[PDB]
Amino acid sequence: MRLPDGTLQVMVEARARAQVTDYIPGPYLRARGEVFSEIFPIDEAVVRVLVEELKEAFEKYVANHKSLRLDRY
Amino acid sequence: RLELPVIPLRNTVILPHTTTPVDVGRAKSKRAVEEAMGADRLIFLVAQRDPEVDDPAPDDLYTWGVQAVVKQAMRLPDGTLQVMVEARARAQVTDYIPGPYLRARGEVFSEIFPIDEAVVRVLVEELKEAFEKYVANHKSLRLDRYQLEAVKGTSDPAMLADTIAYHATWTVAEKQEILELTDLEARLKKVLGLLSRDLERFELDKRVAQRVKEQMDTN
Amino acid sequence: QREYYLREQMKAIQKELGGEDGLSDLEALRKKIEEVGMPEAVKTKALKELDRLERMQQGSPEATVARTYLDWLT
Numbered sequence: 001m002r003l004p005d006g007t008l009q010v011m012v013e014a015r016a017r018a019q020v021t022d023y024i025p026g027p028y029l030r031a032r033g034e035v036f037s038e039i040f041p042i043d044e045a046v047v048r049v050l051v052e053e054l055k056e057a058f059e060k061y062v063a064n065h066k067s068l069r070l071d072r073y
Numbered sequence: 074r075l076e077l078p079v080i081p082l083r084n085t086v087i088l089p090h091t092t093t094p095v096d097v098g099r100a101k102s103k104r105a106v107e108e109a110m111g112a113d114r115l116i117f118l119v120a121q122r123d124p125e126v127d128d129p130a131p132d133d134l135y136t137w138g139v140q141a142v143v144k145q146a147m148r149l150p151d152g153t154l155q156v157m158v159e160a161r162a163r164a165q166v167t168d169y170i171p172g173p174y175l176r177a178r179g180e181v182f183s184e185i186f187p188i189d190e191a192v193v194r195v196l197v198e199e200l201k202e203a204f205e206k207y208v209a210n211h212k213s214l215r216l217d218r219y220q221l222e223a224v225k226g227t228s229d230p231a232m233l234a235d236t237i238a239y240h241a242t243w244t245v246a247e248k249q250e251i252l253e254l255t256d257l258e259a260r261l262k263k264v265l266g267l268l269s270r271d272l273e274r275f276e277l278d279k280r281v282a283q284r285v286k287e288q289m290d291t292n
Numbered sequence: 293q294r295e296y297y298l299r300e301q302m303k304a305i306q307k308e309l310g311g312e313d314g315l316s317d318l319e320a321l322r323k324k325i326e327e328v329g330m331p332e333a334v335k336t337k338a339l340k341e342l343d344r345l346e347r348m349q350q351g352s353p354e355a356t357v358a359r360t361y362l363d364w365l366t
Binding site: 063069 | 188189190191192258
């Protein structure tokens with residue numbers, strides 16, 4: 001939703017990442033991407049155990065907001 | 074809306090669900106009551122100190138007041154008129170136009186909204202045990218016999234804040250410096266710190282009572 | 293009754309703000325004798341002079357002499 005005053009109402013959601021292979025001197029700004037690259041690690045059970053450990057740490061972190069007062073939602 | 078008058082207070086504040094007859098025998102405040110009855114029928118009470126003569130000093134007027142409504146208009150000639158009141162919440166006349174006499178134009182409601190009910194539950198447990206330990210200390214029951222099985226059955230934040238601080242007899246400077254802040258839990262931490270001071274007074278004077286009675290029999 | 297009652301309360305209220313903690317001139321003078329030095333005959337002579345000084349009330353003419361001898365020793 002474009003406002004003609006200098007304020008852009010925009011909501012974006014990322015899908016994947018890329019690389020920078022070219023630079024353009026502004027004006028105008030423009031860039032080039034590259035192919036997608038990611039690896040899927042095996043033995044996902046210990047990975048989920050580590051996820052549960054970090055989630056238990058975050059769960060203890062939620063009730064420990066004593067100085068910035070974050071809600072329990 | 075229209076012209077809303079200002080009625081001063083005694084050393085005793087009126088809070089929600091407080092049924093107490095008001096003593097307006099003041100010669101410049103009865104016209105304010107008449108303007109309030111012609112001013113959407115509500116009494117504006119801002120916190121003052123003790124009843125003085127008709128010359129409003131400006132420094133007892135601070136930024137916070139309470140609301141009172143007019144429910145029973147019974148013409149009593151003693152100067153004390155029993156008014157059932159009800160404050161929905163606490164707010165004030167905000168902006169101040171200089172007199173004389175005392176009249177100023179404020180506007181729309183100023184409040185806090187209840188967020189984070191878990192700390193409210195922890196706070197209400199703390200103040201729960203905290204009032205029931207101090208009712209064992211002194212004589213201040215101060216409740217007429219119509220509540221003999223329903224003293225434990227309400228756990229809302231604003232009403233308990235305006236009962237635990239309310240029935241507790243303090244110095245009045247504390248009792249009206251609690252009013253001006255309008256956040257959730259700061260007022261309740263002030264109540265916690267103040268009755269922690271109170272229990273420290275209890276341990277202090279019982280400890281020096283112990284030491285003075287050992288001083289007596291030792292001497 | 294109210295007099296000695298209330299002033300015994302006052303003197304009992306007064307011990308909860310500052311513990312004496314800091315050693316008096318005498319105790320400080322004894323630890324001053326013990327820490328620095330000493331040759332042991334001079335140390336026992338200084339301790340005997342200190343125990344002679346401790347029995348006295350302040351303001352005596354020879355208390356000045358014993359105090360001056362001790363702080364010239366230390």
